[PDB]
Structures are given as structure tokens and as C-alpha cells.
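Box 3.1. Reading complex inputs
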Amino acid sequence: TASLSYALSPAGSRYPLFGTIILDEAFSRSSHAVAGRIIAALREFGLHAV
Amino acid sequence: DFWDAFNGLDREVLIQQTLQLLAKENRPVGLAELAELLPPAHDLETFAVW
């Protein structure tokens, strides 16, 4: 997600011009709190997630 | 988090609950009616199951 934010964002803008991301089997193997922390990572990167 | 994962909805119990509800009502019961009649605790998954 960090790298995809890197690719999707030119310099200057705090958000990438395309903010949406898609997650298949999102969190299929992470303990609940681990999933929450990954979600927090998504939010830190500031993305709209599926 | 372990106890969050510990407990939740049960699909089969929801099958039984819906069977009882729709045998008692003996009519088409919409999603809002099913949610109101059956106490909501994990309402997302109950809508999905219905």
C-alpha cells in the first residue's frame, strides 16, 4: 500500500489523484487487531478501500 | 481481540430463526421487518444471510 501510494501520487499533492484501492480476501489470515492495524495503515496512507 | 473473534453470529441459528419467523408470519417478510423482529447484534451478517 505504501508503494502503491508512491506510484499513484505525484509530488506536491498529499493524496494520490486516484484514491481507491481494492482488496480481495482482505484480512483472510490476520488476527483481528492485526487487521485493525493494517486498516490504520490504509488510513495513514489516506486511501478509499474496498 | 481473541474474544472478539471468539464469538459472533451463527449462520445455522439464523437459518432456524428465519425458518421460525417465516413460518409464523407465513408471508413475505422484507429485510427491515426481519431485522426488527430478529434482535440485531450482528445485523450486517444477518442481512447477508437473508
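In summary: The CA atoms of residues 19 and 33 of chain B lie 14 Å apart.
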